[PDB]
Amino acid sequence: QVWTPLNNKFFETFSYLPPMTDAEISRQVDYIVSNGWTPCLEFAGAESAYTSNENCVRMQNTTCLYYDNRYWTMWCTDGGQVLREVQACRRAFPDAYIRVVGFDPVRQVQVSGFLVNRPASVRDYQGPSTRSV
Amino acid sequence: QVWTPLNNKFFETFSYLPPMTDAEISRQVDYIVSNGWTPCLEFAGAESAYTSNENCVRMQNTTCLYYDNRYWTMWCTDGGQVLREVQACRRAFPDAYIRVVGFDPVRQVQVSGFLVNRPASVRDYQGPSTRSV
Amino acid sequence: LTYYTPDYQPKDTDILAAFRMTPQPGVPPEEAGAAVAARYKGRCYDIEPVPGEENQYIAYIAYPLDLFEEGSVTNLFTSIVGNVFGFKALRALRLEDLRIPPAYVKTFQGPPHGIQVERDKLNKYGRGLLGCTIKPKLGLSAKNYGRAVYECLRGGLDFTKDDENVNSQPFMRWRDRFLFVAEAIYKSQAETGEIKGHYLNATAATAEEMLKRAECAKDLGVPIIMHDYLTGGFTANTSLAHYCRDNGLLLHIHRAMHAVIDRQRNHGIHFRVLAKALRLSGGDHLHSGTVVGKLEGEREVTLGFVDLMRDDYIEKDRSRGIYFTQDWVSLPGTMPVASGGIHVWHMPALVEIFGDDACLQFGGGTLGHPWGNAPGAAANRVALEACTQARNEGRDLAREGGDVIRAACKWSPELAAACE
Amino acid sequence: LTYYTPDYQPKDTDILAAFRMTPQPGVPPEEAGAAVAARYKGRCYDIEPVPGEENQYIAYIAYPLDLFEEGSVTNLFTSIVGNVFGFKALRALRLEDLRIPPAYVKTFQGPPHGIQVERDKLNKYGRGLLGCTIKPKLGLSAKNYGRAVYECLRGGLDFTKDDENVNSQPFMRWRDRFLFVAEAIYKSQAETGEIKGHYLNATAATAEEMLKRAECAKDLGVPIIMHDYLTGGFTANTSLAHYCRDNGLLLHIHRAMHAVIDRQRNHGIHFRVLAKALRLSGGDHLHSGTVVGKLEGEREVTLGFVDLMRDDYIEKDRSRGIYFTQDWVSLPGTMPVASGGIHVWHMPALVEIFGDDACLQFGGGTLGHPWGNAPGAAANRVALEACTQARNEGRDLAREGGDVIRAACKWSPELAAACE
């Protein structure tokens, strides 16, 4: 079989697994909470979801390690609350990818980041069986 | 609530207030005239209304403080005349944002600049209640 | 006394200083002024007693223009206040004002752009500028710092700034912060369509390192950097201001360690002299006051040094602390930045006091808005714009600020959660 | 013995070494420790016999901080192990550990970015990184090398790397390879939407040539380069690490020629000392182990040097080979890279042993997947993500790795052809 290079976009962690269900998202959020970390939600439409070099035109010397759309837009006690917020974000922005992020409150660093929602309207991604043709 | 990052463009001064009525525009123009300044009208279509880096590709060394579309196109005794010119510009260019500018005649510098018209056809901006979702 | 000449008429090129001095008992004021004064000799030409304070006099000293190095704030401060605060004959000594003759002013470059060039470059007119200090102060990673910057700027804020003590630390190296802040600035610009900026701290150990950080900011295309002039030094500041003029960068100036010199009324150098030294050395913005509760300090004194750092021609006004008429001969003005706890209902007062040519800074980091950083920034922007619109209509802000805030809140959901 | 002081208490600034030495018969251990030790004199303050080996002792040496040049791994190695392995009085000698006092650590820049800055720059969290070594080792043209890089990266791999002996040869000059690899990296980035990279080998004959190759990588905008520090030298490595910090480049470190010094148990320098020297000199990644069949070497020893090269504070643990408490005073950590034959069903074991802060390298070049390079990369990525998800759910990987692999294979056609 051949890995398809057409409409096969991916979003880093857990993006190569089948779309996670509510129970799986809940278990991941519980894992984040268990470690002592804070979960939050990021979202972006299809125009600002993938990495790009749009602003590299303004730079000189080098553009090493600079990529656009690394930041998404921010949307935290347990899995159920984060799941409710996931549904709320889905209703508010149906054409936007949702990403669950984790933040270590002591080190003040991001420790987690996995996609939990892919807009049905957008078709820039494949499915577990359509990834190979 | 969450500040919407979708179709929420803004145009500097007074852009975060609800759309100004004819009386409010008139009062602002009267304020400009009272100070001894000259009011004029700027307009631009949606393709040249927002700041952009289109011409930065032609530059080297640096692009600091350079942005495209800072200049709009020019379209002056009292509020009523400027209001009449605002209606004339609206009729002539219905799909164009209109901006009232002020110029100090002694210092020869721009002293004022507020948007007074948002084309109904264009939907790149939100409303006072739709700015948060 | 060869150095006390009450009949002397100061020349148009003399540098004049007004010293508030309290001599030791038994020392006549004329003798103390003669000592401070002591062809190239400084001379005391005028002494006036302070009405209200015992044994307190204002001594006016005239220095010849040939005494100082052209375009050197360092030399000016070395000559005027080098070793005069250590005189045993003076119980206390306080430099209150300086008169910089146009001949000297013309030897300085001044601020890189000034207020009007800043407004033209940023395309923002008719309103004050808004800024936030990213909080927490320290410990945040460059990624999280950039995330906070983007969240605050997308709300409607014109600027964000690094904390005064954030230069380059194990927790957040400076180049990582510069890159992430550049990405955040560009994202917020694309989202809102307004030109955004972040005061990147270039303050460093060596002038070479400071110029390297300025060079990185220039290579990223970002608009503005920051410097601590009272801790970095006038020599470092002047180098940075010349660089910023050469490369088209804005320069925000933070007055760290200022209270160590301008707090006590009897000893030190009044902030107005430090503000004039900054305007000579160069700076587009200068943190000029704190708003704890309300704008602190005598209003007239604040207005005096704001006018001294803004206008081109300030006439002598002892009520506001102007001891000398200051002609700036078209030197670019410096924008005052009022920082601290700028609460939403306190915006009308500061808009009335400062006007449009100032930057209001939310150095508290906001975060008081229950919804988030972005809606809090929007609420602030909505409040500032509503106050400006009311002032332009002829309203008296000091009397109708609450009414204007309420009326703006009636239609702004973001301000509704902020006004509570 | 003036150099054996068993009552000496090491200072907070002393550099401490733990030597495992076997003296010649007739030589008492105290005399041998005194010799190794021999105001600026190194002294033996502690000697413990090895329980389990005949005539084997651990000698603890304390060196004053004034003995070494600030920020110089070269000098440190010259002072500690310059000429001590050639002593006739010692049958065998092995440096086991070093204690770098914070005072010395602060004089080093350390790794250019570290683990957390790497994760933030690459925007990859919660999982280990994946890499492949382009195979065949040599003979491939720059075009074909780039084609292989693109095929492996588009599958889902985060990194690819040049072979250790691929620097610049008649068959493939370095600049052609850099250009074709840059095109491949950018194509794979555009196709998958994830940030990709390739460890470009900058190892060269002269420091000037190495810096030129780093400069080319910087001019292409590619993320990461590679260096052979034990063959290129600490002086060359430190220059490259300073350059990478200055220009925002990641630095992968390969330990070529390491077994010539860290293989024999009785003679040489233990890899943990080389890992600490690398972390001081600078490196974001450090090839730290081989997985032939399974992770080779005592697990505790591996865990010890992985913690030593990762954590900020490692307490003394003789079970894992930590002879001294190591405080890193906020020096950036180095990411360990486990390479070799990482088969799909062996992923759960390595994920359990290393966790998320490691890079698993398929130095075998994969190619075992009947479909191609890209599906093989996808299978590996699917397996790693499934193992990580299972571990996050509370599963015991060492007991359910096969079940997790099978369950992932049930829905992954690419992994189905790999699991067979």
PDB file of C-alpha atoms in Angstrom, chain A:
ATOM      1  CA  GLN A   1       0.000   0.000   0.000  1.00  0.00           C
ATOM      2  CA  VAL A   2       1.149   3.644  -0.467  1.00  0.00           C
ATOM      3  CA  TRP A   3       0.959   6.376   2.235  1.00  0.00           C
ATOM      4  CA  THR A   4      -1.393   8.966   0.634  1.00  0.00           C
ATOM      5  CA  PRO A   5       0.179  12.480   0.242  1.00  0.00           C
ATOM      6  CA  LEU A   6      -3.265  13.999  -0.554  1.00  0.00           C
ATOM      7  CA  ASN A   7      -5.375  15.571   2.259  1.00  0.00           C
ATOM      8  CA  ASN A   8      -3.387  13.660   4.945  1.00  0.00           C
ATOM      9  CA  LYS A   9      -2.627  16.405   7.539  1.00  0.00           C
ATOM     10  CA  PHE A  10      -1.701  15.499  11.130  1.00  0.00           C
ATOM     11  CA  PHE A  11      -1.596  17.375  14.454  1.00  0.00           C
ATOM     12  CA  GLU A  12       1.330  15.909  16.503  1.00  0.00           C
ATOM     13  CA  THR A  13       0.423  13.787  19.596  1.00  0.00           C
ATOM     14  CA  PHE A  14      -2.253  11.055  19.273  1.00  0.00           C
ATOM     15  CA  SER A  15      -3.066  12.305  15.762  1.00  0.00           C
ATOM     16  CA  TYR A  16      -2.157   8.926  14.219  1.00  0.00           C
ATOM     17  CA  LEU A  17      -4.639   7.027  16.389  1.00  0.00           C
ATOM     18  CA  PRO A  18      -8.364   6.806  15.421  1.00  0.00           C
ATOM     19  CA  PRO A  19     -10.434   9.847  16.620  1.00  0.00           C
ATOM     20  CA  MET A  20     -10.625   9.616  20.456  1.00  0.00           C
ATOM     21  CA  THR A  21     -14.048   9.067  22.048  1.00  0.00           C
ATOM     22  CA  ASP A  22     -15.401  10.964  25.045  1.00  0.00           C
ATOM     23  CA  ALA A  23     -14.205   8.261  27.445  1.00  0.00           C
ATOM     24  CA  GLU A  24     -10.699   8.274  25.950  1.00  0.00           C
ATOM     25  CA  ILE A  25     -10.459  12.086  26.111  1.00  0.00           C
ATOM     26  CA  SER A  26     -11.710  11.875  29.707  1.00  0.00           C
ATOM     27  CA  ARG A  27      -9.030   9.325  30.602  1.00  0.00           C
ATOM     28  CA  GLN A  28      -6.318  11.477  29.016  1.00  0.00           C
ATOM     29  CA  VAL A  29      -7.517  14.541  30.936  1.00  0.00           C
ATOM     30  CA  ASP A  30      -7.586  12.472  34.133  1.00  0.00           C
ATOM     31  CA  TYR A  31      -3.988  11.464  33.438  1.00  0.00           C
ATOM     32  CA  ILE A  32      -3.043  15.128  33.033  1.00  0.00           C
ATOM     33  CA  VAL A  33      -4.845  16.060  36.260  1.00  0.00           C
ATOM     34  CA  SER A  34      -3.310  13.120  38.183  1.00  0.00           C
ATOM     35  CA  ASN A  35       0.221  14.368  37.456  1.00  0.00           C
ATOM     36  CA  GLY A  36      -0.682  17.717  39.008  1.00  0.00           C
ATOM     37  CA  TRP A  37      -0.990  19.565  35.695  1.00  0.00           C
ATOM     38  CA  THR A  38      -3.632  21.981  34.432  1.00  0.00           C
ATOM     39  CA  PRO A  39      -5.648  21.095  31.306  1.00  0.00           C
ATOM     40  CA  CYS A  40      -6.896  23.748  28.893  1.00  0.00           C
ATOM     41  CA  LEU A  41      -8.376  23.845  25.395  1.00  0.00           C
ATOM     42  CA  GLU A  42      -6.890  25.315  22.194  1.00  0.00           C
ATOM     43  CA  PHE A  43      -8.817  25.782  18.938  1.00  0.00           C
ATOM     44  CA  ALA A  44      -8.070  27.016  15.436  1.00  0.00           C
ATOM     45  CA  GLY A  45      -9.894  27.130  12.136  1.00  0.00           C
ATOM     46  CA  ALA A  46      -8.525  25.506   9.011  1.00  0.00           C
ATOM     47  CA  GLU A  47      -6.842  28.733   7.891  1.00  0.00           C
ATOM     48  CA  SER A  48      -4.623  28.913  11.002  1.00  0.00           C
ATOM     49  CA  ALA A  49      -4.303  25.246  12.008  1.00  0.00           C
ATOM     50  CA  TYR A  50      -1.278  24.051  10.010  1.00  0.00           C
ATOM     51  CA  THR A  51       2.261  25.380  10.251  1.00  0.00           C
ATOM     52  CA  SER A  52       3.212  28.011   7.691  1.00  0.00           C
ATOM     53  CA  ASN A  53       5.973  30.435   6.707  1.00  0.00           C
ATOM     54  CA  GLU A  54       3.768  33.457   6.049  1.00  0.00           C
ATOM     55  CA  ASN A  55       5.688  35.875   8.292  1.00  0.00           C
ATOM     56  CA  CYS A  56       9.181  34.696   7.302  1.00  0.00           C
ATOM     57  CA  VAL A  57       9.069  37.402   4.612  1.00  0.00           C
ATOM     58  CA  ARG A  58       9.626  39.995   7.370  1.00  0.00           C
ATOM     59  CA  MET A  59      12.797  38.383   8.734  1.00  0.00           C
ATOM     60  CA  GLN A  60      16.477  38.464   7.898  1.00  0.00           C
ATOM     61  CA  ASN A  61      19.596  36.642   9.145  1.00  0.00           C
ATOM     62  CA  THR A  62      17.756  33.365   9.763  1.00  0.00           C
ATOM     63  CA  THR A  63      14.328  31.799  10.228  1.00  0.00           C
ATOM     64  CA  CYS A  64      15.549  28.673  12.036  1.00  0.00           C
ATOM     65  CA  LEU A  65      12.973  27.250  14.512  1.00  0.00           C
ATOM     66  CA  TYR A  66      10.391  29.880  13.501  1.00  0.00           C
ATOM     67  CA  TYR A  67       7.039  28.609  12.260  1.00  0.00           C
ATOM     68  CA  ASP A  68       3.633  30.252  12.127  1.00  0.00           C
ATOM     69  CA  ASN A  69       0.434  28.833  13.641  1.00  0.00           C
ATOM     70  CA  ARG A  70       2.330  27.056  16.415  1.00  0.00           C
ATOM     71  CA  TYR A  71       0.126  29.078  18.764  1.00  0.00           C
ATOM     72  CA  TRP A  72      -3.580  28.314  18.742  1.00  0.00           C
ATOM     73  CA  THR A  73      -6.274  30.312  20.580  1.00  0.00           C
ATOM     74  CA  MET A  74      -7.037  29.506  24.265  1.00  0.00           C
ATOM     75  CA  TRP A  75     -10.673  28.486  24.983  1.00  0.00           C
ATOM     76  CA  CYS A  76      -9.808  22.981  34.653  1.00  0.00           C
ATOM     77  CA  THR A  77     -10.429  20.593  37.552  1.00  0.00           C
ATOM     78  CA  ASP A  78     -11.280  17.137  36.168  1.00  0.00           C
ATOM     79  CA  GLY A  79     -12.084  15.183  33.028  1.00  0.00           C
ATOM     80  CA  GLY A  80     -15.809  15.911  33.067  1.00  0.00           C
ATOM     81  CA  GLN A  81     -15.378  19.685  33.096  1.00  0.00           C
ATOM     82  CA  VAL A  82     -12.868  19.593  30.238  1.00  0.00           C
ATOM     83  CA  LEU A  83     -15.235  17.339  28.290  1.00  0.00           C
ATOM     84  CA  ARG A  84     -18.082  19.805  28.842  1.00  0.00           C
ATOM     85  CA  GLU A  85     -15.812  22.596  27.622  1.00  0.00           C
ATOM     86  CA  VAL A  86     -14.922  20.460  24.589  1.00  0.00           C
ATOM     87  CA  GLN A  87     -18.613  20.169  23.693  1.00  0.00           C
ATOM     88  CA  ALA A  88     -19.065  23.904  24.282  1.00  0.00           C
ATOM     89  CA  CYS A  89     -16.140  24.707  21.973  1.00  0.00           C
ATOM     90  CA  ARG A  90     -17.521  22.282  19.380  1.00  0.00           C
ATOM     91  CA  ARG A  91     -20.888  24.047  19.429  1.00  0.00           C
ATOM     92  CA  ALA A  92     -19.359  27.536  19.332  1.00  0.00           C
ATOM     93  CA  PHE A  93     -16.779  26.757  16.605  1.00  0.00           C
ATOM     94  CA  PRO A  94     -17.925  23.655  14.608  1.00  0.00           C
ATOM     95  CA  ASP A  95     -15.325  24.176  11.810  1.00  0.00           C
ATOM     96  CA  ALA A  96     -12.338  24.413  14.218  1.00  0.00           C
ATOM     97  CA  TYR A  97      -9.797  21.781  15.385  1.00  0.00           C
ATOM     98  CA  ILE A  98      -9.757  21.476  19.222  1.00  0.00           C
ATOM     99  CA  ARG A  99      -6.505  20.623  21.093  1.00  0.00           C
ATOM    100  CA  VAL A 100      -6.151  19.685  24.779  1.00  0.00           C
ATOM    101  CA  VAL A 101      -3.053  21.254  26.338  1.00  0.00           C
ATOM    102  CA  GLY A 102      -1.402  20.564  29.676  1.00  0.00           C
ATOM    103  CA  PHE A 103       0.571  23.046  31.796  1.00  0.00           C
ATOM    104  CA  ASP A 104       2.863  22.135  34.744  1.00  0.00           C
ATOM    105  CA  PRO A 105       1.938  24.817  37.366  1.00  0.00           C
ATOM    106  CA  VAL A 106       5.335  24.565  39.181  1.00  0.00           C
ATOM    107  CA  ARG A 107       7.765  24.641  36.196  1.00  0.00           C
ATOM    108  CA  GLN A 108       5.373  26.998  34.308  1.00  0.00           C
ATOM    109  CA  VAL A 109       5.997  24.991  31.068  1.00  0.00           C
ATOM    110  CA  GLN A 110       3.633  23.243  28.601  1.00  0.00           C
ATOM    111  CA  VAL A 111       3.757  19.477  29.250  1.00  0.00           C
ATOM    112  CA  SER A 112       0.894  18.147  27.089  1.00  0.00           C
ATOM    113  CA  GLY A 113      -0.758  18.833  23.692  1.00  0.00           C
ATOM    114  CA  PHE A 114      -3.050  16.400  21.796  1.00  0.00           C
ATOM    115  CA  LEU A 115      -5.838  17.044  19.224  1.00  0.00           C
ATOM    116  CA  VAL A 116      -9.327  15.895  20.403  1.00  0.00           C
ATOM    117  CA  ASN A 117     -11.522  17.257  17.556  1.00  0.00           C
ATOM    118  CA  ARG A 118     -11.303  17.367  13.712  1.00  0.00           C
ATOM    119  CA  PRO A 119     -14.014  19.506  11.966  1.00  0.00           C
ATOM    120  CA  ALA A 120     -16.195  17.238   9.766  1.00  0.00           C
ATOM    121  CA  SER A 121     -16.580  20.200   7.338  1.00  0.00           C
ATOM    122  CA  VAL A 122     -12.782  20.359   6.703  1.00  0.00           C
ATOM    123  CA  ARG A 123     -11.362  17.467   4.595  1.00  0.00           C
ATOM    124  CA  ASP A 124      -7.588  18.169   4.885  1.00  0.00           C
ATOM    125  CA  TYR A 125      -7.114  14.909   6.868  1.00  0.00           C
ATOM    126  CA  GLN A 126      -7.611  11.162   6.144  1.00  0.00           C
ATOM    127  CA  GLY A 127      -9.045   8.316   8.281  1.00  0.00           C
ATOM    128  CA  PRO A 128      -7.167   5.334   9.852  1.00  0.00           C
ATOM    129  CA  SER A 129      -8.050   3.120   6.812  1.00  0.00           C
ATOM    130  CA  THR A 130      -7.781   5.870   4.121  1.00  0.00           C
ATOM    131  CA  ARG A 131      -4.208   6.857   5.186  1.00  0.00           C
ATOM    132  CA  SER A 132      -2.870   4.201   2.736  1.00  0.00           C
ATOM    133  CA  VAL A 133      -4.082   3.719  -0.899  1.00  0.00           C
TER     134      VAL A 133
END
